[PDB]
Amino acid sequence: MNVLQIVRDHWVHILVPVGFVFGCYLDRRSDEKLTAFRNKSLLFKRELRPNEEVTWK
Amino acid sequence: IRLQEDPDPEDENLYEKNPDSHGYDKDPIVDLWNMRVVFFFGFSIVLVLGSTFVAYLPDYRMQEWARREAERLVKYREANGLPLMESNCFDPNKIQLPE
Amino acid sequence: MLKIIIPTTMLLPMTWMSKHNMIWINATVHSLLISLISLSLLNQLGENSLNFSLTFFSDSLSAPLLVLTTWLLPLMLMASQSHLSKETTTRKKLYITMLILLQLFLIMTFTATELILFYILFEATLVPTLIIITRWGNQTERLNAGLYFLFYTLAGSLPLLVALVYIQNTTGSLNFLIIHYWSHPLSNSWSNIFMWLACIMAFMVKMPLYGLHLWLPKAHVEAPIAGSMVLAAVLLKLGGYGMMRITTILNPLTNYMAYPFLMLSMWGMIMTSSICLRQTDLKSLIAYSSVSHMALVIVAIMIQTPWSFMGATALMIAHGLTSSMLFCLANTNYERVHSRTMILARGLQTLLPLMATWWLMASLTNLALPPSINLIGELFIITASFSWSNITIILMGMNMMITALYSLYMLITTQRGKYTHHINNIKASFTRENALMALHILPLLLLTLNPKMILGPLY
Amino acid sequence: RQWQPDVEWAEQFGGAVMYPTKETAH
Amino acid sequence: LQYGPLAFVLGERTTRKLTETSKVITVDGNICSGKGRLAREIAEKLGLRHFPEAGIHYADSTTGDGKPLDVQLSGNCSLEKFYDDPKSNDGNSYRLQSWLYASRLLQYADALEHLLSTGQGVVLERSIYSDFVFLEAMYRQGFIRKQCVEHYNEVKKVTACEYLPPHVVVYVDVPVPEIQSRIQKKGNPHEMKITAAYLQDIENAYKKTFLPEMSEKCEVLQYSAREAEDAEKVVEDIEYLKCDKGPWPDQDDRTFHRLRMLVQNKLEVLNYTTIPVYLPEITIGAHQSDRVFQKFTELPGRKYSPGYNEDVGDKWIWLK
Amino acid sequence: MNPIIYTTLIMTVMSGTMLVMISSHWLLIWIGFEMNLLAMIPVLMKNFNPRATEAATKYFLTQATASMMLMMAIIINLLYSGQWTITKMFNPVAMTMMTMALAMKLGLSPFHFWVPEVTQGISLQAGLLLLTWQKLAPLSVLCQISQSINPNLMLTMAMLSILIGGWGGLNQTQLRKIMAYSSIAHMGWMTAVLPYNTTMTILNLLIYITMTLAMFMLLIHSSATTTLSLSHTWNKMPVITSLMMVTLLSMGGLPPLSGFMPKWMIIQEMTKNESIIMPTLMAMTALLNLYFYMRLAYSSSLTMFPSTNNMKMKWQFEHTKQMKLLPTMIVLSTLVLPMTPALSSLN
Amino acid sequence: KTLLHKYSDIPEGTECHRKAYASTSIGGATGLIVSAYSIALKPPASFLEGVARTGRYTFTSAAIGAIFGLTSCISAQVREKPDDPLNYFIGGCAGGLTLGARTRSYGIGAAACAYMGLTAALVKMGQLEGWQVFAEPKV
Amino acid sequence: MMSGRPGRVPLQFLPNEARSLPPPKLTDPRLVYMGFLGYCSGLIDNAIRRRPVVSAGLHRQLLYVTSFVFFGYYLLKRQDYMYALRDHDMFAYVKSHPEDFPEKDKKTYGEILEEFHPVR
Amino acid sequence: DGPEKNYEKTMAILQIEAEKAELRLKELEVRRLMRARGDGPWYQYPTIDKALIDHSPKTTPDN
Amino acid sequence: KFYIREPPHGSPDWLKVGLTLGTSVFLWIYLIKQHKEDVLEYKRRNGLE
Ligand SMILES: CCCCCCCCCCCCCCCCCC(=O)OC[C@H](COP(=O)(O)OCCN)OC(=O)CCCCCCCCCCCCCCCCC
Ligand SMILES: CCCCCCCCCCCCCCCCCC(=O)OC[C@H](COP(=O)(O)OCCN)OC(=O)CCCCCCCCCCCCCCCCC
Ligand SMILES: CCCCCCCCCCCCCCCCCC(=O)O[C@@H](COC(=O)CCCCCCCCCCCCCCC)COP(=O)(O)OC[C@H](O)CO
Ligand SMILES: Nc1nc2c(ncn2[C@@H]2O[C@H](COP(=O)(O)OP(=O)(O)OP(=O)(O)O)[C@@H](O)[C@H]2O)c(=O)[nH]1
């Protein structure tokens, strides 16, 4: 149904939504470099559970 | 005639071209569609769920966790008879005040 | 963090590459969508600010302003698609480009973790607004108006630049957390006052206090509708955000040096509100009202009291939403009458009955009528100020008394009274203007139920 | 329509100097 | 390629191509005097490039398809309108003259560009040096305000100074009673109402000003109507000069390379025509000028640079 | 002038400046300055108008005098030290001697009086060369001998450069005179930081290079020399006026535009050197440049000045120029602030 | 800066005649410099009015220099407060007022009062604290 | 300032010993911004020449991104070199000058007398 | 997510900022220190190489 | 068609454009291999691999 044209005039609508899902990616990538004191602060440091290896992602 | 210019255009009335005009733009079909966007993506998805989202937001500022700790802490303190909350905060016994 | 920024900047290619007539639609869609995502950021923890990385972080103060700016973004698009319809598609796209580029900077500065990073886009907001005021402004004196607005802020901002880099060379980093934890008692040495003056005057200028405020009436009146809202609803408030952030290393020097500003602000609000009582221009009257409310925050922030900060953040937002609405009121009336004089179009309520209502809660909200967020702001500030000194309530309450007279003065002169005979072009209000007006008032009363969201980190 | 510059604004920016005097008059 | 500096360095000169058939001969005279007829005959009998009189749409002829664009889109002036009310308040008179001066000034460049790039002489009607005879005529009866003269001159020195004068000028001498004779036979109702004074005032300014002061830098030969029709007589007269006076028999490849630089750049040749001195007849306000520019831009072909308009059929835009 | 002759003349001018930057011997430094001068005059003479002759004569007299005065600084240093090596020289009078000798070539102090007038007389392309390339050679010597400079003497020369250079700019109609006054103002900014740290003296140079290439070649593309003539360019090509206002704002130094990067780093350095009053005053005078910057921006694109009916021909035709390196010039001259830490490459 | 050193050597609010002599010498030299420049850039068509021009400029600058000399020193003497920046402020405004008298205009005198008085405070601010304008290369 | 350090061979854009540093990763955020600059030149390049901006000469702006990326990449390695160099001889100096860098005494906030100013 | 993420992540932020803060303060001190003394790697202002010295016997013994 | 003369860029300058792809793919393939050779050499020099 006209798809050759609804795509051309409404392909802009996907830009921002992928931008958001992209924005989460760098958000969930930059934190990895910020690991450092992962389960290290004595306020929150505790015994590591049998299966999971990382307390906070 | 000073300069070869144009007379000031007259403000067209969107209503007299189409009586149902919503004032969003000239062309009727997009104007009706702009209505749907401004309301559906205005009042509907932002005001309704956004209010519920912020209203049902999880514990903010620990407003209730502190209460529960205070109840337990105050219940501990007057049970032993010592004052229910000390005038001092950082225990002076450790403090090594100069002279 | 990023989940707001890339969606904002990736919005820019959309408007440029969208269809010829769909620009307003798709921009409005995702601007509201961005608002929803920003509202997801509104959550805050107990005491530690929501920290994201070295480059960005948010606290209980930044978050309410962030959601306000994103919330604003649809409103200019809604408010502007009437006087820009007869314009070439490129200029319309350029106009939209200016707004979101402006709005993008606002997210950046409010979330900035480093004072210099906060500083770089602190003036960078000026460039898009300068274009908006100058190019699309609809007046003659807008040219001198843009010059006044531009030079005033720069004249105050540049001392901050020299001051800020001095902090870097003396106290290492200028990360907001590292300043707060390593704060040291600023001495009374005669250099430290000029230290104090430079770190403060920059935020003074774009928070119009009596004397340093003549740009605002020239800024607001000649600016177009979208320029007026963004300038009055967020731009006057970067100065506010700076003071809550930068006063960490200005104590106890703030205790003694606060006096000239406090007297200037407290007396200024009586003077400025008096100007409102006899303003011939509706837009100017609203503009001067912003000075009075903003000058109240000057006393609020500069007292440096837990309660004072809280009421500041309450007036921080409530005034911005209200001032944007009143500018919408003036704009929605202006093009119908094609003039700015208040007495030009009297008795509008008999002609437009719904706008009579919209003007009515708008005036009531600016009245600080309880329990509107404005009342929570002013009433909290009065108590904090009264604890600081008993006399100030004489000045404080007098402002509310003056604020009553001029607020309903526009109501009676415009809405009530006899309709003007000669005018005959007043058409029934487009439901766009009506929809936009509710877009402003409805969240305001919605905020009344949850002040704690906008009370701030002091809460 | 929005105000736009005219010959009054143009001649304000036209000449040897926009800040003139008797010395610069000639 | 063009005459870009690489071309001149690699060996592209100008003196090699030009020969004795390299002249800027102008056939000129009074209104409707048959100068255009004689100009064609000289062109045919000498193998010499002809240039018809530059009208309002001569610039339109050069660009695009050559179809005359709308007067609103090109000219804001009509000669027929100037005929109806020569002293109209809208400034149709001076706007006509100034646009006409630009059109012939462009025509002068087109003649020089073809001449220098081919070595073939050029014949054109009413060279820009003779354009003043109309403005002088339009000034005597007040068809234009006095200030139009200075602006027209101000453009003239800042432009016509660089363009050097012709080689030999052909003049069709025609008396006013004769001019009052043919224009009835023309038939177009706009040119019937031309005043005998206007036909007079062009004549003396043609006679006592155009011919003598300009004669010291090129040959001048005067022909009445009979010697105008005698194509055989005039053509051998044109061949029978040495053409010593004038700058043309002095320059070398250095100037011609520079001359072809200015002429080839079609923006530069009329760059000084849009002089920023403001007068009511020629100045157009921002709103009117902007709207027309949008109307000009939305036209096909002119939306982008030449060879870059997809609407007309410019394929491979993504690769050009 | 024959293009081959023109190319050679530029080639020697470039080499003469190149000779200065690559010579360890004081005599050769002078050789580069004079032979650069020896070929600068004919370029200004390309148009050959009486205004140009006045401009070229003014330029030669001041440059020849400064270069000749430069010799004594070499000779006096020779006399007291017997060293032709370009290093920290050994005489306060000789150090003082050359500092104004080089300053006249740059035109910072009242010495700057030749800078505006010569630019006015000569063509736009020649002005671009004079105000951009001809400033590398005098700066090269100052960078090498920065360790020997009297701080008070050089800071003053920098101060009046931005001070007067910005102050008179408010009263200029001709764009050429505006650019020169901007150049004198920008001259002070680099020269002020020169005694403290030479790294960002260079950083200011390439950045200040970028706008002046950007502005002048934009102006050449506009083919306009006056404010009113520039104003009419909105009708012909509105886009170019748009980029020019970006550069005008950028060259003014408003963040986040590129022109803010030099000034920001300059303020940072002298703040590290305990000089904190000095940076503040220059920043205050920086708005002086911004004013006539805004005035040009107001006339160019922010507003819409009246046009002339004769502009209609310009619509029909097109530009034949190639404006080489213009695309990358303005982009590199307006948004490079995020790439600031790249200045360590200069070090 | 031996001529400038004269002013610094004399303690504030002490030996007012010496401070006045030191101050007026600074003004006289400064007036001479600007007057010589004004003669240069602006041609004094006739020589005698050229001496009139430099006479006016020197007489003015000396007056501001002199008046600031007393008012600063006597105020410190009277109020027994040498460190007080206000001592220069009143002197600075006093000097500015003298400029208005020489030009015979209240507006220029008022403007000079505020600006010069503010700067006069600031320079004293720097002398007390230790502000350096032409700082030597430290880093 | 590194203007005369021992070993600086002149006119050497990237000295050999700089290769001992982690090279910039091919999608370093600084690098992509350098690629942005190349693209941003491309769009305006068609603008001055009055071409269909975005869809105009795909070859032209494609080269711009390539050129800016490489010239960016080598710049980043050189930029990383000096900062590594600036920090390297920094550390070598402080060990060589222990007397000029005393180890400040370890006192907790308990013993520090920091006077308190009320806000009243 | 849990407050542990924000708590630990902000601790890393403070750790990075503290090291950066103290390094800049050290950098200004070192730059001042080695500029004055001069016995440092950088700030070594150029001198004349001893290689360019003619040690061959001259025409005059007194050399 | 519209313009009566073939404007200078009206035709695809095949020799010039084909050069532009040629240099860019050269510019890239140099970069990836340069990044590659820099990586393991750094790894080998600094220990690692
Ligand atoms: C930092 C703050 C901001 C600083 C810069 C501000 C600049 C503007 C400020 C105001 C300037 C003065 C007022 C406006 C002047 C307008 C000048 C002008 O020429 O306007 C009219 C003109 C008409 O357009 P035209 O040239 O025909 O081109 C149309 C597109 N082909 O319009 C034009 O020529 C404009 C053409 C614009 C073309 C835009 C193309 C965008 C392409 C986007 C591609 C996105 C790709 C995304 C990919 C995502 C996945 C990776
Ligand atoms: C603590 C130690 C010092 C104690 C003593 C106080 C300082 C010294 C005395 C005061 C010096 C500053 C006050 C101004 C002195 C020069 C006044 C002058 O030149 O007046 C003439 C003229 C103004 O009049 P004009 O505009 O020409 O109008 C009439 C035209 N027929 O001038 C002009 O037209 C040109 C504009 C004025 C001249 C330029 C600025 C001169 C001052 C610069 C700063 C000097 C600072 C001196 C002290 C610190 C350094 C030692
Ligand atoms: C339009 C005018 C400005 C508007 C109002 C702006 C605010 C007013 C004050 C402006 C101050 C600008 C300069 C401040 C920079 C940072 C100051 C700082 O960090 O404090 C220093 C304060 O030191 C200063 O001297 C700062 C400058 C003091 C004010 C004098 C210069 C500024 C005023 C004149 C220039 C600006 C006015 C406009 C001129 C056209 C600390 O250094 P210190 O002196 O303690 O250093 C150690 C030791 O004592 C020796 O250094
Ligand atoms: N102002 C002005 N009018 C011109 C010019 N050239 C021609 N005209 C007008 O053009 C009209 C008719 O052209 P003419 O050349 O005079 O007469 P014609 O009937 O075309 O015949 P020919 O003279 O043989 O070309 C007259 O109204 C002229 O005044 C010119 O350069 N300037």
Side-chain angles (χ1 to χ4, degrees), chain C residues 315-379:
Chain C
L315 195 52
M316 264 333 308
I317 282 78
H319 157 272
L321 256 180
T322 315
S323 315
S324 68
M325 158 144 33
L326 289 134
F327 273 131
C328 284
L329 268 304
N331 181 48
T332 46
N333 188 358
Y334 160 65
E335 62 290 77
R336 319 227 209 222
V337 83
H338 276 352
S339 267
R340 274 192 209 117
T341 313
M342 209 187 333
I343 66 108
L344 221 337
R346 314 151 325 206
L348 253 56
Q349 158 179 142
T350 119
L351 315 155
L352 312 188
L354 195 51
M355 233 46 51
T357 76
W358 294 133
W359 229 316
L360 180 289
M361 300 72 40
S363 351
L364 271 38
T365 6
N366 171 81
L367 265 206
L369 154 57
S372 77
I373 304 275
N374 324 82
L375 189 270
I376 293 122
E378 313 216 25
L379 183 273

Side-chain angles (χ1 to χ4, degrees), chain G residues 4 7 23 26-27 30-31 34 57 60-61 64-65 68 88 99 103 116:
Chain G
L4 167 82
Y7 200 103
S23 82
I26 298 289
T30 309
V34 55
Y57 290 7
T60 54
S61 80
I64 296 97
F68 172 76
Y88 277 26
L99 198 298
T103 195
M116 164 95 225

